Ligand binder design. Structure first.
Ligand code: NI
Length: 341
């Protein structure tokens, strides 16, 4: 049975609610993004209307085989009427195709559902500037002050400079980057660009990337591993064992691997600066964990909410324990007393 924080009151709508069977009264199922915890349940046999971005619709059709007649793509930044209710989709600054949804209820209430997002001051100049929000359904993944990490631009600068130095010292080094979902594509695209290479990958991953509307993609990626000196591998292979096994397969072209694991936050963020990060090394293999986040830091979340001034907040992440719920409620009250709403 579908929980309450996935239902939108006064509508026939649900958000990210595909794992509960037929939801009673649901006339339209919204999907914020193509991550498996949020699409869980969708397959080629789904027969109700799905509303989403163009990019998420490309992934539902090609990767999950949902039939075309049940996919309803909407443009961003555009007022649209769905089953008699005005909605707008907004860029969530999460993975490709990820949206927030603004719902204009027939009774006059306005609701924002963030989906998964990385809050940014640019959101303060979207269509959100124009009117008030009564309820905010909020991605609270990192809602605690210990969760700090750098800008995506600082993290990319570290990765490009690290990879360019290594491969200029040793032209026979291979670079490998881990992946297990869409998102974080800038990591491997920026490294391949500084090296003057296409990125090489499995046919399955190539297929996924080809759904993402990235400009000039055909110039940036390939399935011909032998032509490329930046390879993508499943995240589960980014360890000394898996990397050894990969180097064997490269036919003596390479004598060293430098590998990247984009993570979210890790406890070494509570001590070490991006600049000071060092790898784990065994022999001719080095692995860097880099803190490339597509979710709000605590400070970015707090800024967004203090600017929006919602009347009520409903968390959508970390909802399963009393201790988490109580922590989040305390920070929401601090923020409100501090800013005066
Ligand atoms: Ni996500």
């Amino acid at each position: 049975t579908c929980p309450f924080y996935k239902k939108i009151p006064g509508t026939g709508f649900t958000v990210d609610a595909f794992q509960y069977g037929v939801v009673e009264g649901c006339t339209a199922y919204f999907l914020t993004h193509f991550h498996s915890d949020h699409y869980a349940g969708l397959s080629k046999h789904f027969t109700f209307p799905v509303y989403c971005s163009e990019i998420t619709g490309n992934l539902l059709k090609n990767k999950l085989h949902v039939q075309e007649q049940y996919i309803h793509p909407l443009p961003l930044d555009t007022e649209c009427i769905v089953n008699g209710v005005k909605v707008v989709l907004l860029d969530a600054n999460h993975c490709p195709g990820a949206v927030m949804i603004l719902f204009y209820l027939p009774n006059g209430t306005v609701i924002l559902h963030t989906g998964d997002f990385r809050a940014d001051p640019s959101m303060e100049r979207s269509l959100l500037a124009d009117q008030k929000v009564h309820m905010l359904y909020l991605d609270t993944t990192y809602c605690s002050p210990e969760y700090t990490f750098p800008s995506q631009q600082e993290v990319i600068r570290f990765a490009i400079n690290t990879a360019f130095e290594a491969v200029t010292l040793n032209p026979h080094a291979l670079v490998v980057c881990g992946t297990y979902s869409i998102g974080k594509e800038k990591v491997f695209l920026a490294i391949a660009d500084v090296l003057g290479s296409k990125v090489g990958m499995s046919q399955e991953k190539y297929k996924t990337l080809q759904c993402l509307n990235i400009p000039e993609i055909n110039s940036l990626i390939t399935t011909d591993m032998c032509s490329s000196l930046v390879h993508l591998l499943p995240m589960m292979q980014i360890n000394f064992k898996g990397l050894q096994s990969h180097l064997k397969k490269c036919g003596g072209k390479y004598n060293q691997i430098l590998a990247f694991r984009p993570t979210g936050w890790t406890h070494s963020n509570k001590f070490t600066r991006i600049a000071d990060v060092i790898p784990q090394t065994k022999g001719n293999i080095s692995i860097y964990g880099i803190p490339y986040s597509e979710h709000s830091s605590y400070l970015e979340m707090k800024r967004f909410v203090q600017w929006l001034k919602p009347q009520k907040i409903i968390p959508t992440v970390n909802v399963g324990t009393w201790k988490s719920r109580s922590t989040m409620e305390k920070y929401f009250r601090e923020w409100k007393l501090e800013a005066g709403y």
